[PDB]
Amino acid sequence: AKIKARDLRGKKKEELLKQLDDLKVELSQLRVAKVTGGAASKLSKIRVVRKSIARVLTVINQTQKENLRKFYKGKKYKPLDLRPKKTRAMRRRLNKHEENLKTKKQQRKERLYPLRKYAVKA
Amino acid sequence: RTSPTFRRPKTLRLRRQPKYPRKSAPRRNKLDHYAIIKFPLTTESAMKKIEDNNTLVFIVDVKANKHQIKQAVKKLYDIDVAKVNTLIRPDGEKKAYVRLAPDYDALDVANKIGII
RNA sequence: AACGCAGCUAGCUGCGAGAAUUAAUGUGAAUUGCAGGACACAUUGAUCAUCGACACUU
RNA sequence: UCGGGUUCAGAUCCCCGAAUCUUGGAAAGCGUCGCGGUUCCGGCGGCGU
C-alpha cells in the first residue's frame, strides 16, 4: 500500500503513467474533501499522496535520462544538459591532453639533461 | 541596370540543421488538466449558480485561459461546456464559471465530484 | 528581485507546480503545538544528516 | 449591444429575449383590487396603461 522508489525502477514505462494518473485522480478528490467538510484522516492523505507524485515522477525523470546518456555515450556531440557542468571557468580550461602537450625543443632538452639524484659528503 | 540605386542582392539562406539537439528531451507539460482545476468552490453564492444557471464554479490556475479550462473539465468529468467566464479574485486566484450544455445537468454531475 | 508551496501557517526559515521537499547513501524508532499518518525496523525502515541522481515558476 | 429580470454584496459582464408608424410589443414592465402561503408558493388571478 506504500509506494516505494526501488520497486518502481524495474517497472515498465506505460503503467507508470497509469500509476501516475490515478494518484493524481485521488489527489483531486482529496482537494474536494478539503473545501467541504473533511475528516482529519482524509486531511492527512494529501501530503503522502503528494509525495508519491514526486516519488513516481522522480522515477520517470530518472528513468528517462540514462537512455539519453547511453544513447549519447559514444557520440561526438552531446546535449548541453548531458555534458558535465562543474563550473563555468573549469569548463574553459585545457583538457588533460593539451596541458601535457610539449614541444620538440623541450623533449630533446629533458632527455639529454634529466634531473639527477645526488648527495654531498660533509 | 534600369534603377540608379544599388540594392543588396538576395542570397540563399539555409535552414538550421543542428549537429545535436541543445535540449536532450522535450520539457514535460507541467500545466495539465489536473493543474487546470485546483478545486471546486462551495460558497453560498456559488450554490445559486449550480441550481439556477446550470453552472459550476471552480478555482483554476491563473495561467489557464478559457479554452484550456473548457478542455480540462470535459475530459476530467465527461461533460460538455457551453461557455466559461473567468475572473481573478482579489486574493490572486482565478475563478471560472463553467456552464454545461443543456443536455447535461449540473446537479447530478456535481454529485459525481461529491461537491453537491 | 517577484510570485507561489504546509492538514491546521501570518512572520522567520526551507523549498519551486515533483514546491517546509523527490531519489540515493549513512544512521537507526521517531515528529510534536494539536490531530492524523506512521513504524515486520531484513522477505529492509520513522526521523535526522550527508548529498554524487532527478527536478528547479516569472 | 440593447430591453426586462436577478444578489447581502456583480451587472450594457449573470438569466431571459431581441440583434450585430410598424416587426420587436405586451407575453414585458408599471399602477392599483384581490386570492393562496407564513424561513415552503420564487404560486395565482381583476381591472388600466
From Swiss-Prot, chain A:
Xref: CDD domains: Ribosomal_L29_HIP
Phosphoserine: residues carrying this PTM: S28
GO BP of this protein: cytoplasmic translation; maturation of LSU-rRNA from tricistronic rRNA transcript (SSU-rRNA, 5.8S rRNA, LSU-rRNA); translation
Pfam family, one: Ribosomal_L29
Subcellular localization: Cytoplasm
Family: Belongs to the universal ribosomal protein uL29 family.
Subunit-level organization: Component of the large ribosomal subunit.
NCBIfam families: L29 (TIGR00012)
Protein name per Swiss-Prot or TrEMBL: Large ribosomal subunit protein uL29
Protein source organism: Homo sapiens
UniProtKB/Swiss-Prot annotation, chain B:
Family: Belongs to the universal ribosomal protein uL23 family.
Subcellular compartments: Cytoplasm; Nucleus
Positions of post-translational Phosphoserine modification: S3
Keyword flag Nucleus: yes
UniProt keyword annotations, A-Z: Acetylation, Citrullination, Cytoplasm, Isopeptide bond, Methylation, Nucleus, Phosphoprotein, Ribonucleoprotein, Ribosomal protein, RNA-binding, rRNA-binding, Ubl conjugation
UniProt key word Phosphoprotein: yes
BP terms from Gene Ontology: cytoplasmic translation; translation
Disulfide bonds: none
Signal peptide: none
Protein name listed in UniProt: Large ribosomal subunit protein uL23
Outcome when changing I59T: Found in Diamond-Blackfan anemia patients; uncertain significance
Main location: cytoplasm
GO CC annotations, alphabetized: cytoplasm; cytosol; cytosolic large ribosomal subunit; cytosolic ribosome; extracellular exosome; nucleolus; nucleus
Record text on subunit structure and interactions: Component of the large ribosomal subunit. Interacts with LYAR and GNL2. Interacts with MDM2; this interaction may promote MDM2-mediated p53/TP53 polyubiquitination. Directly interacts (via BIB domain) with IPO5, IPO7, KPNB1 and TNPO1; these interactions are involved in RPL23A nuclear import for the assembly of ribosomal subunits. Interacts with IPO8.
The record's account of how the chain is modified after translation: N-terminus is methylated by METTL11A/NTM1.
Protein origin, superkingdom: Eukaryota
Modified residues (N6-acetyllysine): K30
